[PDB]
Amino acid sequence: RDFNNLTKGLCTINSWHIYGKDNAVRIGEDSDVLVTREPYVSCDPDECRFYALSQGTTIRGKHSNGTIHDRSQYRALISWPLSSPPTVYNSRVECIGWSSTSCHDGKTRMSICISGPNNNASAVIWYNRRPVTEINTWARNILRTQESECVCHNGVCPVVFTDGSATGPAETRIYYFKEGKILKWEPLAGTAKHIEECSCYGERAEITCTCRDNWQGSNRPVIRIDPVAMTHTSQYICSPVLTDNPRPNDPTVGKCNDPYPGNNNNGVKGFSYLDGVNTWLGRTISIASRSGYEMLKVPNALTDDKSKPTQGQTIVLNTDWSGYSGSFMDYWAEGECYRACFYVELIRGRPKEDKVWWTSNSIVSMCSSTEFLGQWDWPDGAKIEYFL
Amino acid sequence: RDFNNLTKGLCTINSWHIYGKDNAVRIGEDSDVLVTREPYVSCDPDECRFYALSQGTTIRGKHSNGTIHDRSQYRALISWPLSSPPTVYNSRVECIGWSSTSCHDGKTRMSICISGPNNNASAVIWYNRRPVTEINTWARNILRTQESECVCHNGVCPVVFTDGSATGPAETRIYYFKEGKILKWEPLAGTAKHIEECSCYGERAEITCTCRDNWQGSNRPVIRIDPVAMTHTSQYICSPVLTDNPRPNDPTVGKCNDPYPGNNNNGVKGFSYLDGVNTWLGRTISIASRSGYEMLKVPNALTDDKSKPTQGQTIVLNTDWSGYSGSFMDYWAEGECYRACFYVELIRGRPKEDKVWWTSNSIVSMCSSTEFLGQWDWPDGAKIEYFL
Amino acid sequence: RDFNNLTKGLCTINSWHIYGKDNAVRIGEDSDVLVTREPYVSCDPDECRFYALSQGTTIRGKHSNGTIHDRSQYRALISWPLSSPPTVYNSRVECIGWSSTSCHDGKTRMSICISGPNNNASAVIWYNRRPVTEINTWARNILRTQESECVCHNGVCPVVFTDGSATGPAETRIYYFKEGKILKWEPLAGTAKHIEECSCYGERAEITCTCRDNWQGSNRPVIRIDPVAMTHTSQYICSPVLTDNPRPNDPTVGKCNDPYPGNNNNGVKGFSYLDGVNTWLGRTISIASRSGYEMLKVPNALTDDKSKPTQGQTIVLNTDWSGYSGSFMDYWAEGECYRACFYVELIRGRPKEDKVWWTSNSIVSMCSSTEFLGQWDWPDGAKIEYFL
Amino acid sequence: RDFNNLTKGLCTINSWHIYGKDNAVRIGEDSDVLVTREPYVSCDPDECRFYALSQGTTIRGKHSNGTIHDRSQYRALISWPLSSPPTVYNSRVECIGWSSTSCHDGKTRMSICISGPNNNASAVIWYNRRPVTEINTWARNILRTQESECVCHNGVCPVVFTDGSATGPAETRIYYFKEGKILKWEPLAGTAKHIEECSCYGERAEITCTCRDNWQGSNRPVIRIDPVAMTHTSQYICSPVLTDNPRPNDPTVGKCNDPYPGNNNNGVKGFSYLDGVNTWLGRTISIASRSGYEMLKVPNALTDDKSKPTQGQTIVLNTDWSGYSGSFMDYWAEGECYRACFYVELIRGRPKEDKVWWTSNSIVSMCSSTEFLGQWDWPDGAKIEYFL
Numbered sequence A, B, C, D: 001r002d003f004n005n006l007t008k009g010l011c012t013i014n015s016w017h018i019y020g021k022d023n024a025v026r027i028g029e030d031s032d033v034l035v036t037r038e039p040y041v042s043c044d045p046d047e048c049r050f051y052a053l054s055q056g057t058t059i060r061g062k063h064s065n066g067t068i069h070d071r072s073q074y075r076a077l078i079s080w081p082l083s084s085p086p087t088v089y090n091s092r093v094e095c096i097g098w099s100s101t102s103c104h105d106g107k108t109r110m111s112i113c114i115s116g117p118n119n120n121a122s123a124v125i126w127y128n129r130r131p132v133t134e135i136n137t138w139a140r141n142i143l144r145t146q147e148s149e150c151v152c153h154n155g156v157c158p159v160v161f162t163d164g165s166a167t168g169p170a171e172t173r174i175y176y177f178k179e180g181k182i183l184k185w186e187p188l189a190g191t192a193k194h195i196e197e198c199s200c201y202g203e204r205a206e207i208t209c210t211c212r213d214n215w216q217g218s219n220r221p222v223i224r225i226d227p228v229a230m231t232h233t234s235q236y237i238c239s240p241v242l243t244d245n246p247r248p249n250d251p252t253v254g255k256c257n258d259p260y261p262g263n264n265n266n267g268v269k270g271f272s273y274l275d276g277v278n279t280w281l282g283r284t285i286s287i288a289s290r291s292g293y294e295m296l297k298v299p300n301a302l303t304d305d306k307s308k309p310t311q312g313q314t315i316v317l318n319t320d321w322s323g324y325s326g327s328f329m330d331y332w333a334e335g336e337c338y339r340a341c342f343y344v345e346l347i348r349g350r351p352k353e354d355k356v357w358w359t360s361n362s363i364v365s366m367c368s369s370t371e372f373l374g375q376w377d378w379p380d381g382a383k384i385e386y387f388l
């Protein structure tokens, strides 16, 4: 109809209720489920769906052997109905590639897939299910993007890309698209020293992205975008409650404009909702691996370098595998506020469970409640022994 | 369009004709069918569909092992086309949880799923396929609901919940929702001493619920709701024709305001249509187990403590497994009256058939006819030996 | 929109072109295809689909054992997209039963399924996917119907039923339905001595049904219905070109008002287009079994007791299995005439191929062409050896 | 809405970006994927889909044995969602046959399937999913057509057919259809000596077809059609950059009106975009077999007998199997020009990989970009060893 505009502020997050779970690996043990990774969730005005990067094979299929690898010519961005598994028969391919992002602007959806060899990748921007624009690699080193939904405001949908080293300074760009066409792009500015896989959400005409400093920081970089001025800023979450993984143990004081040191060249896609006292951070429980997952209310986390948790909710037990996590919201729901939501990628298989030769995941997602709900843990649920 | 209003009275029930049957277990022996239980049927203005609680695995899948258990993080309310089986590819997830209810109000559908650990469950109310409201456990003991469709009148859709012990007094509440939001709630009142899994239907602006007194009664409690005054009453079916299971043998006189004694701490979801002489009761044939199923016309069953059958129809032979049963009607059919309908859950597997490690079911449903139709029996039809 | 009216006459049939073929048994050897029999084809104003009586199991499933049997509680009328196979995932159940008919009246579709034990069957008439009317058995001996589409004119859709013996005189009725409700019914009149499974089509406000005299005749009985006067007549095809199976060898003169003798208590559903010189008859090639299939132009077959073929087209080789055949037309196509069409049921399995324990079929259908097209043969194509 | 008119010219082709890839053989190793060949891509005003000739069996099914054969009664033209594989459950049958073409005219789609024995084949033209016209074989020797999409202009959709020998002069015809009816047909004229499987596209009210001279030429014949005058011409691509396969090595000067000699009685369906300097030719890399695939910019290839490449892009490595290739464009995209697109059939199985008894393929397709994008290679990706 008309372009959606980020006119509301976030609803108060007093707890998280279960939104969707596909139990993909469990079901896929005996049905035609595609092997995936890098999942996310994204809504259209009339439907919300699960998204992911398929590996172009079923989990039980012999081609599942080797799916720990990230970039092949057999991958594609696919979407399928909420809480269903990604099956060969219900999955819709949005585009071909090994890194992607996608968002609805109110009138139609923009999907971006990047493919190619390491030194010659290219992104192709699809709008209304048609290819519209193409961007060639600018640093010739794995052009890559969000791995979660982008956000739009009055037709403008910014997207963060990175090209170059994942363990050194790199060339990150913020592209402002409208109807799949480039209105403008900027180089990253601010104090964030390295950006990877931004998780974004919008409220009151401002887009907030919590990303991954794969180089030096265990605290997360944050990119705030103004989609009207088409300008942005960058810093890190000030809080000592560190949210990347692997990471050092929490200090008593964090860093606002520098990576918090202790772990180099590694990390995990993650997210947060930075909204004053209504601030919640997600993180794996383990400081060593993609294990467990929790949400912690850390009032003023973004700007208070001594902020510590005031409330919390466990999402996945430390005795269960987790993985990527990101933000999305249903900008087309009824009400006066935007209900914050997120998903956690529950990775199964390699490298942690090497008795099988594949790597895949299932998805669990929650949204906020103004009630103070009791908590449960949501593991993948599959028994690897069954796949042997 | 506009909210549906219960303006008609029931059609005269002279017999029952076959409405739907999915033969799920038979078909699922060699196809991707989800393991389920707690099924029901519910209509939208333009389509009627089967519903159930999936176990997040196929019947032939190795994860089918253990599905006798009720509450796990892998369950979800799913719906699928009438008479089809619940397959991995045609099932639509309505919400995540291990207890549910669902009903269309004329404009859109409300679905409710409850999940969580025993002492910290929470219900989330979805309306128009979006989460709208959340209710936390109030007695910290398996918050649970109908397991069959709710009914709406002018936007108001009451739903009965119970929280606390299943073998003692508990805290039952009647919630009146409108567009997924709570208008009001009451504590249970009347003479029913314990309520579990209410089966409901509406006619002439009154909602009638036949439930399960899991504590002491073998006669069924009944809750009549006024969705306009948003008030209700409760009693038991007076009739000596006892309809819970397990149960004592029928007496010559029943009880109107107390549980009929003889069997404690057990029962089965069941239903009835209480309409003066046009009164029909459903029950398992066996007084000992979920075996067989029949419909008996017991004129004035609700109010006549000596009412006995005047006509009957066998639905399932006592030599075949049955299970849950409940009411639903197509409030959007043509005509001057509401045609009463019901479904019977045909449970296969554990605990009665322990040669297999799973527990599932298929569905059979009938609706009333003003004709006096010949009868047939409708078993599940699967040969367990095939699954060995 | 508006009720369709049979306003056109038939197109000139100069040959038959291929319309649809699902290769169900071939494909089903390694995919989830339901076991069926008694198929047909029927169109809606915007789509034409395949129909059949499912056996409630896949062909490879263990429950396929025993599907030679006709009437069980696991059967249902299902429809699915033209030329696709009847799979567990794309088949739509129209109603539950072991005998059926179905037709679109222009506004919506009426489907009829009969179920029950031999002495207590009942038909339930569905209209707009809702049960509307029910008819109880009148002779208490396998109430049964067409097994192919009915035809409508200005809302009136006649359907022929038979109840009683299949090897003696029986009680056949012509029901005139409108919006699923009974407007009127008649007992069969005319000279046809026994009616079974009528194949019908309409043109210029007249409905012609070619049926099966299972009792004594090897020539086919014909029922012509006036859907406006709601009256009918009956006779046999006069032609010596006999079209039932099994049958005697063709004589030089046929019978117009009596069964042509030679074979008792057996037959096969078949059809014909009786239109003066534009008259074509279908029949199995073998006079002994459901083997092969051909179309023969026999000008004035209905009224000329010495009519013999003037042209022909082989549909299936005598070295391939055939079975049921019936008529249907797309009353909603463009043009000035109705293009005659038909399907042939290609039965595989029992009783002729008893190395397997199942019985199923695939479908092939042709429509007429005013061109004189070359011919090909269309067998089922599956290798039974593969199923062993 | 209204008939589409070829009002735009081609976009400038500076490179090719990835459009779709179904990874059919990979996925089909463990899921219900139909065996196919002769694929293509074609768009409707609101969706673009993959098309192919199914073999009426899954790849893993036992009936896959023997699918190297071209013409059987089990084949059919099927279409399915872009980038999905052709599965038993998502494939839509357009018509029955072993040679086909299909195109949308703006209002609806015309699909053509030819079937029959070698000496008695017939084409049936479907429009709006209904059979409308039929054409009988005129040379009684495998009537056959494009195997890729046709193109329409103001309702007129020309289609090229050939009937007669594939290794000698034959009878090629250009049919001009409108709403599935024949407006006119011509015999082939011009200097092309033999035509097979034309690949077509339209721009500025002109339709260009690049075909296959299976008889003598290794250069490709070209048929340019005027859909308004309903007239055409024919010649060969002048360029020495030979594009059929098998073929001699490139000379320094090509032939404009005669086949370039060196290889007889063989070839492969291929295509090109002939647009002055904006001219790109596709060809297998190997001159000996259907191996590898590349795109070469050969300015003025059609008219310059000494034209050689000025730029290029590899699509498939010479160490990977390729096959058929053809043109299609989304005539309903936004913008001022038509974005040229093409697909390459990646054949797996027989005859090159005879360890398996089947022959099938997967599809990869690209569209043009005005950017100068980096290149990647796109192989089928399946490991034959897995199928053993």
Ligand SMILES: *[C@@H]1O[C@H](CO)[C@@H](O[C@@H]2O[C@H](CO)[C@@H](O[C@@H]3O[C@H](CO[C@H]4O[C@H](CO)[C@@H](O)[C@H](O)[C@@H]4O)[C@@H](O)[C@H](O[C@H]4O[C@H](CO)[C@@H](O)[C@H](O)[C@@H]4O[C@H]4O[C@H](CO)[C@@H](O)[C@H](O)[C@@H]4O[C@H]4O[C@H](CO)[C@@H](O)[C@H](O)[C@@H]4O)[C@@H]3O)[C@H](O)[C@H]2NC(C)=O)[C@H](O)[C@H]1NC(C)=O
Binding pocket: A240, A241, A248, A249, A250, A251, A285, A286, A287, A294, A295, A296, A308, A309, A310, A311, A312, A313, A372, A373, A374, A375, B119, B120
């Ligand atoms: C039914 O449901 C309800 C609703 O969920 C249940 O009630 C909830 O209970 C939750 C668990 O108790 C509770 O969550 C905790 O909240 C704490 C904050 O609340 C307390 O402090 C505030 C502030 O003073 C008070 O207002 C409040 O009244 C409380 O006293 C959090 O602080 C907790 O998080 C910390 O602990 C967990 C382990 O429990 C860690 O995993 C987590 O990371 C936090 O601790 C680490 O990080 C901090 C900060 O740097 C460090 O100080 C600390 O040492 C830990 O650091 C180590 O561990 C991390 C992670 O491994 C590592 O990185 C680091 O290097 C160190 O190794 C926790 O979130 C809910 O708030 C509460 N909800 C509500 C509404 O009440 C109820 O129990 C359920 N009922 C039943 C019967 O089960």
Ligand SMILES: *[C@@H]1O[C@H](CO)[C@@H](O[C@@H]2O[C@H](CO)[C@@H](O[C@@H]3O[C@H](CO[C@H]4O[C@H](CO)[C@@H](O)[C@H](O)[C@@H]4O)[C@@H](O)[C@H](O[C@H]4O[C@H](CO)[C@@H](O)[C@H](O)[C@@H]4O[C@H]4O[C@H](CO)[C@@H](O)[C@H](O)[C@@H]4O[C@H]4O[C@H](CO)[C@@H](O)[C@H](O)[C@@H]4O)[C@@H]3O)[C@H](O)[C@H]2NC(C)=O)[C@H](O)[C@H]1NC(C)=O
Binding pocket: B240, B241, B248, B249, B250, B251, B285, B286, B287, B294, B295, B296, B308, B309, B310, B311, B312, B313, B372, B373, B374, B375, C119, C120
């Ligand atoms: C073709 O189709 C038609 C249509 O269906 C068939 O005709 C139907 O036939 C049915 C079976 O006969 C019949 O159903 C019965 O109706 C009885 C009522 O009718 C009779 O009584 C009335 C009232 O006086 C008369 O008007 C009428 O004319 C008849 O005479 C019911 O009473 C029957 O139910 C009881 O019996 C069945 C077993 O048949 C039990 O399973 C059932 O639970 C009922 O009996 C128990 O409960 C009562 C009440 O407390 C006790 O008194 C009794 O002792 C039993 O109690 C024990 O069993 C229960 C359950 O196990 C247990 O809990 C308890 O503790 C005790 O152990 C029955 O419903 C249809 O009405 C009739 N339909 C029509 C339209 O005619 C026709 O036969 C078919 N044709 C052919 C050829 O097959």
Ligand SMILES: *[C@@H]1O[C@H](CO)[C@@H](O[C@@H]2O[C@H](CO)[C@@H](O[C@@H]3O[C@H](CO[C@H]4O[C@H](CO)[C@@H](O)[C@H](O)[C@@H]4O)[C@@H](O)[C@H](O[C@H]4O[C@H](CO)[C@@H](O)[C@H](O)[C@@H]4O[C@H]4O[C@H](CO)[C@@H](O)[C@H](O)[C@@H]4O[C@H]4O[C@H](CO)[C@@H](O)[C@H](O)[C@@H]4O)[C@@H]3O)[C@H](O)[C@H]2NC(C)=O)[C@H](O)[C@H]1NC(C)=O
Binding pocket: C240, C241, C248, C249, C250, C251, C285, C286, C287, C294, C295, C296, C308, C309, C310, C311, C312, C313, C372, C373, C374, C375, D119, D120
């Ligand atoms: C390319 O395609 C075209 C288009 O299809 C092919 O041309 C077609 O060729 C068909 C086969 O030849 C042909 O079909 C036949 O037509 C005959 C009628 O035509 C002839 O007679 C008329 C009338 O005089 C002449 O006008 C005309 O010019 C011809 O001379 C039919 O009569 C044929 O049917 C009979 O034969 C077949 C076997 O071929 C039987 O299976 C069939 O049942 C008919 O014969 C039985 O029944 C009759 C009637 O009672 C008996 O008299 C006879 O004895 C047989 O009875 C026995 O068999 C039956 C069945 O088993 C049994 O019940 C009974 O008891 C006895 O045992 C046949 O239909 C097409 O018309 C013709 N089409 C066109 C447009 O030309 C062309 O060949 C193809 N090209 C190539 C190169 O292959």
Ligand SMILES: *[C@@H]1O[C@H](CO)[C@@H](O[C@@H]2O[C@H](CO)[C@@H](O[C@@H]3O[C@H](CO[C@H]4O[C@H](CO)[C@@H](O)[C@H](O)[C@@H]4O)[C@@H](O)[C@H](O[C@H]4O[C@H](CO)[C@@H](O)[C@H](O)[C@@H]4O[C@H]4O[C@H](CO)[C@@H](O)[C@H](O)[C@@H]4O[C@H]4O[C@H](CO)[C@@H](O)[C@H](O)[C@@H]4O)[C@@H]3O)[C@H](O)[C@H]2NC(C)=O)[C@H](O)[C@H]1NC(C)=O
Binding pocket: A119, A120, D240, D241, D248, D249, D250, D251, D285, D286, D287, D294, D295, D296, D308, D309, D310, D311, D312, D313, D372, D373, D374, D375
């Ligand atoms: C990142 O991505 C970019 C974008 O793709 C990459 O850059 C591209 O690099 C491509 C490969 O180098 C390049 O493709 C080539 O372009 C040549 C034309 O360019 C050159 O000549 C022009 C004209 O003078 C100059 O303007 C220009 O500046 C260049 O100097 C083509 O000519 C190439 O095609 C020929 O070679 C390939 C092998 O490379 C053959 O397979 C192909 O068939 C062509 O050669 C055969 O045919 C010709 C013509 O008859 C014969 O002369 C020749 O002998 C060969 O004939 C034999 O082989 C054929 C096929 O087997 C057989 O039939 C015959 O009988 C003989 O046996 C080639 O297309 C892109 O244009 C370039 N793109 C861009 C934008 O720059 C970049 O490298 C990537 N980065 C990294 C780091 O990898």
Ligand SMILES: *[C@@H]1O[C@H](CO)[C@@H](O[C@@H]2O[C@H](CO)[C@@H](O)[C@H](O)[C@H]2NC(C)=O)[C@H](O)[C@H]1NC(C)=O
Binding pocket: B002, B003, B004, B005, B154
């Ligand atoms: C069910 O009852 C309510 C009345 O209580 C009907 O609501 C009225 O509908 C018309 C058109 O929607 C409005 O102009 C009235 O104000 C509506 N409501 C109220 C609450 O007064 C409703 O239309 C009835 N439903 C149906 C199907 O007829």
Ligand SMILES: *[C@@H]1O[C@H](CO)[C@@H](O[C@@H]2O[C@H](CO)[C@@H](O)[C@H](O)[C@H]2NC(C)=O)[C@H](O)[C@H]1NC(C)=O
Binding pocket: C002, C003, C004, C005, C154
């Ligand atoms: C088929 O015939 C009936 C007439 O018998 C047509 O019905 C008339 O349609 C118009 C518009 O629907 C009404 O105003 C007339 O009163 C209708 N009916 C009768 C029964 O008189 C019907 O429209 C015809 N069908 C079609 C497709 O033209």
Ligand SMILES: CCC(CC)O[C@@H]1C=C(C(=O)O)C[C@H](N)[C@H]1NC(C)=O
Binding pocket: A038, A070, A071, A098, A099, A142, A144, A166, A196, A197, A214, A267, A268
């Ligand atoms: C390539 C660098 C990038 C960010 C560190 O790495 C990612 C890390 C991954 C990971 O940490 O699991 C998985 C992603 N599939 C991969 N992205 C690509 C494009 O391969």
Ligand SMILES: CCC(CC)O[C@@H]1C=C(C(=O)O)C[C@H](N)[C@H]1NC(C)=O
Binding pocket: B038, B070, B071, B098, B099, B142, B144, B166, B196, B197, B214, B267, B268
């Ligand atoms: C938990 C108490 C409740 C009512 C007695 O028990 C039910 C009995 C069941 C049963 O008797 O079969 C099955 C239901 N799955 C279960 N409900 C839940 C929420 O577990």
Ligand SMILES: CCC(CC)O[C@@H]1C=C(C(=O)O)C[C@H](N)[C@H]1NC(C)=O
Binding pocket: C038, C070, C071, C098, C099, C142, C144, C166, C196, C197, C214, C267, C268
């Ligand atoms: C029952 C008599 C009727 C007509 C002769 O028989 C049919 C014959 C059949 C047959 O000849 O193959 C198959 C049908 N499934 C069957 N109909 C029913 C209802 O069982």
Ligand SMILES: CCC(CC)O[C@@H]1C=C(C(=O)O)C[C@H](N)[C@H]1NC(C)=O
Binding pocket: D038, D070, D071, D098, D099, D142, D144, D166, D196, D197, D214, D267, D268
């Ligand atoms: C029959 C002649 C024709 C053109 C040379 O051959 C084709 C060649 C083929 C090929 O070279 O792979 C495959 C096509 N399936 C076939 N067409 C038909 C109708 O069989």
Ligand SMILES: *[C@@H]1O[C@H](CO)[C@@H](O)[C@H](O)[C@H]1NC(C)=O
Binding pocket: C065, C066, C357
């Ligand atoms: C099928 O059923 C028969 C009869 O019940 C049984 O003897 C036979 O062995 C079964 N065959 C198979 C393959 O199950």
Ligand SMILES: [Ca+2]
Binding pocket: A212, A213, A214, A215, A216, A217, A218, A244, A245, A263, A265, A266, A267, A268
């Ligand atoms: Ca890091």
Ligand SMILES: [Ca+2]
Binding pocket: B212, B213, B214, B215, B216, B217, B218, B244, B245, B263, B265, B266, B267, B268
């Ligand atoms: Ca009880």
Ligand SMILES: [Ca+2]
Binding pocket: none
């Ligand atoms: Ca399988």
Ligand SMILES: [Ca+2]
Binding pocket: C212, C213, C214, C215, C216, C217, C218, C244, C245, C263, C265, C266, C267, C268
């Ligand atoms: Ca007979």
Ligand SMILES: [Ca+2]
Binding pocket: D212, D213, D214, D215, D216, D217, D218, D244, D245, D263, D265, D266, D267, D268
């Ligand atoms: Ca050639």
